[PDB]
Design an enzyme around this catalytic site. Structure first.
Site, short mmCIF file in Angstrom:
data_model
loop_
_atom_site.label_atom_id
_atom_site.label_comp_id
_atom_site.label_asym_id
_atom_site.label_seq_id
_atom_site.Cartn_x
_atom_site.Cartn_y
_atom_site.Cartn_z
CG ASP A 35 4.27 -3.01 0.40
OD1 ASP A 35 2.95 -2.31 0.69
OD2 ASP A 35 4.78 -3.57 1.31
CG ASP A 220 -0.25 -1.43 3.07
OD1 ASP A 220 0.47 -1.71 2.01
OD2 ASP A 220 -0.24 -2.58 4.08
C1 LIG Z 1 -5.78 -9.13 5.69
O1 LIG Z 1 -4.43 -9.10 5.58
C2 LIG Z 1 -3.67 -10.16 4.90
C3 LIG Z 1 -3.09 -9.43 3.74
C4 LIG Z 1 -3.41 -9.23 2.46
C5 LIG Z 1 -2.72 -8.71 1.49
C6 LIG Z 1 -1.27 -8.11 1.82
C7 LIG Z 1 -0.96 -8.41 2.97
C8 LIG Z 1 -1.47 -9.10 4.01
C9 LIG Z 1 0.44 -7.95 3.26
O2 LIG Z 1 1.13 -8.45 4.25
N1 LIG Z 1 1.15 -6.96 2.58
C10 LIG Z 1 2.43 -6.43 2.51
C11 LIG Z 1 2.39 -5.11 3.15
O3 LIG Z 1 3.55 -4.52 3.25
C12 LIG Z 1 1.88 -4.94 4.66
N2 LIG Z 1 1.87 -3.82 5.28
C13 LIG Z 1 1.55 -3.73 6.56
C14 LIG Z 1 2.71 -4.54 7.56
C15 LIG Z 1 2.27 -5.43 8.38
C16 LIG Z 1 3.10 -6.00 8.97
C17 LIG Z 1 4.40 -5.64 8.95
C18 LIG Z 1 4.85 -4.51 8.11
C19 LIG Z 1 6.43 -4.04 8.18
C20 LIG Z 1 7.15 -4.82 7.06
C21 LIG Z 1 6.56 -2.64 7.91
C22 LIG Z 1 3.78 -3.89 7.30
C23 LIG Z 1 1.44 -2.28 7.31
C24 LIG Z 1 0.05 -3.26 7.11
C25 LIG Z 1 3.10 -6.40 1.25
C26 LIG Z 1 2.93 -8.04 0.69
C27 LIG Z 1 3.64 -8.92 1.07
C28 LIG Z 1 3.46 -10.24 0.45
C29 LIG Z 1 2.66 -10.23 -0.36
C30 LIG Z 1 1.78 -9.33 -0.83
C31 LIG Z 1 1.86 -8.12 -0.36
O4 LIG Z 1 1.07 -9.70 -1.83
C32 LIG Z 1 0.20 -8.64 -2.44
C33 LIG Z 1 -1.29 -9.38 -2.78
C34 LIG Z 1 -1.85 -9.41 -1.80
C35 LIG Z 1 -2.54 -8.26 -1.02
N3 LIG Z 1 -3.31 -8.44 0.19
#
Ligand SMILES: COCc1cc2cc(c1)C(=O)N[C@H]([C@H](O)CNC1(c3cccc(C(C)C)c3)CC1)Cc1cccc(c1)OCCCCN2
Length: 377
Positions: A35, A220
């Site tokens: 990630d 990301d």
């Molecule tokens: C359409 O959005 C929905 C969505 C889809 C996806 C991931 C995230 C969110 C997800 O949450 N992704 C975060 C990453 O770390 C996210 N990174 C961001 C983020 C967002 C909120 C808070 C933080 C802080 C922790 C730094 C970071 C910058 C965008 C990592 C993650 C956490 C939990 C499960 C995951 C992935 O599963 C991977 C497979 C699914 C991938 N698709």
């Protein structure tokens, strides 16, 4: 010695890419989601319906309790746990062992994914976005401080279940073709970049370039979709709708809910446009572009019906937190996170996406005036 890290990533489609790691003494093996969109190293440390294994701190003689709690809220999922340190290695990585901060996850909500085959997360971004605060040294910072591993890594995410390479400490030239094009890391928190122009099938969206980076643009690997700010998302969907208007879709398809299907092998790829993202370059008034094919933003999903057709989800989403160049954008590119030189490189991947008449590309140089104005403040 980078050949040892080629093909060290696995995953299920849409469920994230993971690398094998070991934690503790004796080594406990866990699959760890890769990630670049967060900065905490965290592992399942208690039973969970979706975990087949987890970190057992009591079984590791090198575990140290930090006597501090921690929680991380992502876009939708979140976990909380207990901070500690332990020895960490990457079997198909460099031959080193580091003492790293580890969040031992004890409770979670919509974080672990049923069938994903990973049990923890490796946040590769910078300390500024680490929880509980930026004094919790991220894994890669620990790796670079304690060993001779150079301060960079590169990701080759290959599409479809899925595989790829994380080259820790360098660039493997057999993984890409053509030239690497670099864009500055704007600020070391997320891997923040500046998009300076957007074209669809060669037509400029002609928006104020600040709109592309409102309120940030990041790379990301932990997010699947290309996510675009509201105004940019609407402009892009309108242009993609117009180009594919010869066919009709449910409008819940454009929201990412309903999947569209065609008879196996008859997907009309030609009616979906290519998207070109221009990134700020390394020299004055210079940019480069990466071109995204519809096979990247139409993500294949297993058909729930008994028919074995080709069904797809629209993998461009509306965002309220800026542009996210997610895994579907990274797939088919070789992406170099060159932390030492505060830059991110893009090249056409050896495992590139195949269209019949079109090809994903990284092309430059381009001239773009006033690129500094495209960053949001
Ligand atoms: C359409 O959005 C929905 C969505 C889809 C996806 C991931 C995230 C969110 C997800 O949450 N992704 C975060 C990453 O770390 C996210 N990174 C961001 C983020 C967002 C909120 C808070 C933080 C802080 C922790 C730094 C970071 C910058 C965008 C990592 C993650 C956490 C939990 C499960 C995951 C992935 O599963 C991977 C497979 C699914 C991938 N698709």
């Amino acid at each position: 010695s980078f050949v040892e890290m080629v093909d060290n990533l696995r995953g299920k489609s849409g469920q994230g890419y993971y690398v094998e790691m070991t934690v503790g003494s004796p080594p406990q093996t866990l699959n760890i989601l890769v990630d670049t969109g967060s900065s905490n190293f965290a592992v399942g440390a208690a039973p969970h319906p979706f975990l087949h294994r987890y970190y057992q701190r009591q079984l590791s003689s090198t575990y140290r309790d930090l006597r501090k709690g921690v929680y991380v809220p992502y876009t939708q999922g979140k976990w909380e746990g207990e901070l500690g340190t332990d020895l960490v290695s990457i079997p198909h990585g460099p031959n080193v062992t580091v003492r790293a901060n580890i969040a031992a996850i004890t409770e979670s909500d919509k974080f672990f994914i049923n069938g994903s085959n990973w049990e923890g997360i490796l946040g590769l971004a910078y300390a500024e976005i680490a929880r509980p605060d930026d004094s919790l040294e991220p894994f890669f910072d620990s790796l670079v401080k304690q060993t001779h591993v150079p301060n960079l890594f590169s990701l080759q995410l290959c599409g479809a279940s899925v595989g790829g390479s994380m080259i820790i400490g360098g660039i493997d030239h057999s993984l890409y073709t053509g030239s690497l094009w670099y864009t500055p890391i704007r600020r070391e928190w997320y891997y923040e970049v500046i998009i300076v122009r957007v074209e669809i099938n060669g037509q400029d969206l002609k928006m104020d370039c600040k709109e592309y980076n409102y309120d940030k643009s990041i790379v990301d690997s932990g997010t699947t979709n290309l996510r675009l700010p509201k105004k940019v998302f609407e402009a892009a969907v309108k242009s993609i709708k117009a180009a594919s208007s010869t066919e009709k879709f449910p409008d819940g398809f454009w929201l990412g809910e309903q999947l569209v299907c065609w008879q196996a092998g008859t997907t009309p790829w030609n009616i979906f446009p290519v998207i070109s993202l221009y990134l700020m370059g390394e020299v004055t008034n210079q940019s480069f572009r990466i071109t995204i094919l519809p096979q990247q933003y139409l993500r294949p999903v297993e058909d729930v019906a008994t028919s074995q057709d080709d069904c797809y989800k629209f993998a461009i989403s509306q965002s309220s937190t800026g542009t996210v160049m997610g895994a579907v954008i990274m797939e088919g590119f070789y992406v170099v996170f060159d932390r030492a030189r505060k830059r991110i490189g893009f090249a056409v991947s050896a495992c590139h996406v195949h269209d019949e008449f079109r090809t994903a590309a990284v092309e430059g140089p381009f001239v773009t005036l006033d690129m500094e104005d495209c960053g949001y403040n």
